[PDB]
Amino acid sequence: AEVELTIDGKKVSIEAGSALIQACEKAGVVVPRYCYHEKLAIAGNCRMCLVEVERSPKPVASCAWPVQAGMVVKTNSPLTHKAREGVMEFLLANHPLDCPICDQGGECDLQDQSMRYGADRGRFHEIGGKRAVEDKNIGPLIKTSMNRCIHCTRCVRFMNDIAGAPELGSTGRGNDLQIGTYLEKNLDSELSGNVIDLCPVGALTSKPYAFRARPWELKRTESIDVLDGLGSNIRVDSRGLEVMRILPRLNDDVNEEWINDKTRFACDGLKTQRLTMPLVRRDGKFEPATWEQALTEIAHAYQTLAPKENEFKVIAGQLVEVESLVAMKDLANRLGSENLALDFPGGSQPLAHGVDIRSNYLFNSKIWGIEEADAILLVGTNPRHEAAVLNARIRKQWLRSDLEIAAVGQPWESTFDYEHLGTDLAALKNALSGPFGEKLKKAKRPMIIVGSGVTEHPDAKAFYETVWSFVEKNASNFLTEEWCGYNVLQRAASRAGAFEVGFVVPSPEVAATKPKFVWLLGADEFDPADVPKDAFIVYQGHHGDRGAEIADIVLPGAAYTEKAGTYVNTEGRVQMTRAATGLPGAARTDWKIIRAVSEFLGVPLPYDDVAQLRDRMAEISPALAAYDVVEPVALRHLSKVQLVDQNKGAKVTGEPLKKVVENFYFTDVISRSSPTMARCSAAKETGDPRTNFMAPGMEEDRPMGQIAYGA
Amino acid sequence: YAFAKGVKELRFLFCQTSQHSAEARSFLNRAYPIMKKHNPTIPILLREAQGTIPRVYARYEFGREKMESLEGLTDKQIEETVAKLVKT
Amino acid sequence: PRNAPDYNVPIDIATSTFTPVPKNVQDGSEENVVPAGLISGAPMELQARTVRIYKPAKPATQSGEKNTQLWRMDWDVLGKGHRWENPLMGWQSSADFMQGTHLTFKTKEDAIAFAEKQGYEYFVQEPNERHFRPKAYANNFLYSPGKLKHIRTK
Amino acid sequence: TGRPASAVMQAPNRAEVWSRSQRPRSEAMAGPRFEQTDFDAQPRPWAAIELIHKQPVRWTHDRIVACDGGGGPHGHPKIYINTDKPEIATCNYCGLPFANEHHRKYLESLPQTSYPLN
Amino acid sequence: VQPTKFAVTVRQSRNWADAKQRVIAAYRAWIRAAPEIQTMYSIPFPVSHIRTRIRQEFERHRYVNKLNVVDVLLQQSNADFQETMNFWRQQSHVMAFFKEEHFRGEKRLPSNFITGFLEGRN
Amino acid sequence: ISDIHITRTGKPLIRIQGGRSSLGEHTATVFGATGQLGRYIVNRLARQGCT
């Protein structure tokens, strides 16, 4: 229940069983802290939160002090003042005078709280000197300047509890206590870059963002991660026309102060192989062209072909925003084509789940639903690779509750214990009626997560009716008023948005027609069978990759960092990206490339301001007008007609469920262009702990150095 | 009974719990599963949002689209209105 | 006509090749709002560009929340004219006269009132807040009757 | 451009760039502005990176050594360098080399070394 | 006009009959003055172009239905009139009110979608 | 008027069309620029960001 208490006179209403520092926050009182983090276990090591409590002879650590029904807390008494100066004097006695060479400079909690709660000068002048410690090699991404360690334990707590990667520790004793693996090892965790943000000081910094910028010079934009389907909320820090770093911003509904390594380091892949001008393939060589006469040769080729119904095909890639889907949907429709394919294999045929009910393809018990999950069945998903931050949230619930996890699919290296039931569809039918099924039947708030990797499995029609028929058999537990145990997990930020606007192949008939013309709209992971060789290929994108290699025209669009695109995450939340920079070269906004080629093909799409194109999106799906919120699905029971009724006679073949992510580091074109992910893969493969693995710096075998980064 | 050939996609826009959408919500809970059994080659998208005045959108070839509202209409009256949109 | 860009707005002295085409220019007739953008002496471009009203998120890098306490109104970056490279010194040149200007407001409705008074287009972003959860030092040492499934290391 | 050696060689002491985002002088001093120009009059300082690696190692018997830059209050903020790895430790501010006397045997056995070592 | 030749003490319109009387007297003075503005500032335009362009600047605020907004729009006019009739504005300020003496000219926004797309937003 | 110019030799120019601080990206040599005509060709290129 609620206890009541006074802090600096003022009554605060905090739940019983919480710490005092939590009530000080709720009461509007700033309490200095270093070790305590809202999302990490309580540690009382720093001693910077020492407050004065009535009926207590010593200062108490507020972070670890539970709130009681009647206590009095003075946070500004002379007891508190001399406590904070004394700790700030100890925290700075052995601290290296490395603020000009430190990357944490200008954004350091040790600096700010020294200015606010410390003394103005220091009393440490020992002829014997300060402590000094050697540096530690803990993989390519993290640079270590360990003299700066203040021993908060925030990273050992994060790596051991949130990341499930217990290789970081604390060896030694007393003043000679040190943070790092005793034997040099490469921190192997797709969440390991969060340690850099968690560090109060710059003892853990990022090797890519080594000495390039100062925090004060960065323009900060609150945008969305599109490198995965979860839609993680981020901050894009840029100095002029170059993105410097990508940080995590709080959103407890999605990502909770955490981002994965791909979404943090792939931004160096935004300045390396960019398409900056229109290209035409002439005599087998890509020639530069203007817009007026690359859009012309689009039209001339289209007139020459004179395609019939559905002979004009579009394939939408995995970084494509909803605005350009709706625009390309229209221009496709005015050309007599409903051939609206998607990048993944099986995406040029209709999907086993429909798109008629929104609940068919969404993560229906929202991401926040895991916080109360009791039993979870994972089907066709290695969530550590497909949805990293989501995987962590599963472990957080597992570590604190009686959560049972079972998986059907390919075994993976998991940060939580899970039962393996099998790899094929029979091993799902045998599980869902086996011992683990009664766990789903008995446990309240059950959760079945179906990976988007089964949608591309040949047996998905059988897989999807197997799952939902169990859900429909087991309602009032799976299908209560506020709960839905059916959840489909996207791994690309474009899939839920395409499904929302109906950007899919409608019928098997349109699927079998050979196209004479393919618009690869940011599509680069297309299966070769889905593009006929002799067709006319337009590639619209931002990075030169497989798609541009085969194109007949290349049209440069915008990356997600210089457009305000609409994206829908796997839970159905409609979020908006904010442009942090402008367009490079002659690139153009993606929806505008579609709208212009409407003039050149003679069917101009009506809207010609993006405000108008958002009014059109509202007609297709009104949820797309609601921002930063999930709109609940009303007819959630109507989902049986696609999942079970239209999936009744399924030609099961027995092929096992396949892995979808061969390389977590190389998933998209932004990632594959990134030098940092190049080093992350190479270090992973060869197990190299050296920070300067393919980077500037002196080595045993490089006395002279090296200017290559990423090679 | 199917939809007339030349119809490409039906789109019902309504609200999850508004009173203005209960009649539309009643229609689809009794209509859509039969509407999908007859012709599975057509998408029939049900898209809702808080405070969505009920609407229906019928698309045909070349991207021609018709919108008839549904406010005030009873459960019965909807069926003829959709029939007008899907019969030729 | 329903978000149609008025391509025939009369430009002014400060209109450039980077000025977007506006949809609505304060006529001076709209009810309950002062047409301050009409009498401000500002260019028409202020009425074409969108501003974002939001509460800045706390840095991931540090635990101070002083900058999250006030609403900021800033102008959105455009696809051309925000930054280009100077051919001579490599400096970054700009055409965006609003690039370094931001406004601070105590409440969301104070920012909305100012935006409508000046004729700005505005997108409001609702703050992301935490979910309270009681945290207890004592849990670090809770007893496991069964398998440990975690080796807490301080 | 091109014909004079000063227009071609990045510094008098060094011929190549020493960072990945450094512009070569060959590309920086191409174009119309560098026509009708004396390239031997152009500012061309000696590269610091070559000079710092010509510095002999300070051998020391201590685990932690103090570097202030060598000029009292005319140096850099005083810091402390740990010399416990079998490598040469370098001051972050000035670059001077330090090495513990315990690693002299190992260091003298390496074929190529980042500092003269004697 | 005590301190300066065309000075008018700042007055607040009493009502719409008064406010419209002042607007018409402001417009009358400006279009009367157009020959005098065209010789002093050596404007290479017909007096008719000057008068039709003066009309546009009143035509912009024809739909203002606020009395507090009209007075500031009237004070701005009176002050502009004073600095033009006294030779205080330079020819550069005056013939910069005509938005065709830009080297890009009157055509400075893109005409429609496609022409602004092929030129990169103009 | 276009933002892209492919020169007769084949190299592409990506111009930003503004005024003095802009990027015309055309490099020009005007022989006979100090007479009465040359000051008009010079001023027209230079004031739009060209060398």
Ligand SMILES: NC(=O)C1=CN([C@@H]2O[C@H](COP(=O)(O)OP(=O)(O)OC[C@H]3O[C@@H](n4cnc5c(N)ncnc54)[C@H](OP(=O)(O)O)[C@@H]3O)[C@@H](O)[C@H]2O)C=CC1
């Ligand atoms: N303006 C007219 O009425 C007409 C002119 N033209 C031609 O157009 C061109 C430009 O006209 P305009 O500007 O009036 O010409 P100007 O006579 O005003 O200027 C001619 C230019 O040529 C340069 N020049 C002349 N002789 C030499 C020389 N022997 N060596 C080097 N530079 C030299 C001058 O430099 P400097 O000042 O140092 O001599 C000057 O920059 C000329 O060829 C002119 O004959 C054609 C038809 C009509």
Ligand SMILES: *P(=O)(O)OCC(C)(C)[C@H](O)C(=O)NCCC(=O)NCCSC(=O)CCCCCCCCCCCCC
């Ligand atoms: P009729 O009854 O149809 O219209 C009469 C009016 C216009 C009064 C309307 O009935 C009316 O009520 N409209 C609203 C009131 C109004 O017009 N408010 C504004 C009046 S002041 C004004 O418009 C000033 C305009 C600019 C003044 C300067 C013009 C010339 C400057 C440049 C000259 C050339 C270079 C030197």
Ligand code: SF4
């Ligand atoms: S961590 Fe903070 S206090 Fe320490 S050197 Fe870096 S900026 Fe200075």
Ligand code: SF4
């Ligand atoms: S390395 Fe950083 S986060 Fe880890 S204990 Fe030291 S100061 Fe704390």
Ligand code: FES
């Ligand atoms: S904040 Fe409680 S001791 Fe660090």
Ligand SMILES: [Zn+2]
């Ligand atoms: Zn030094």
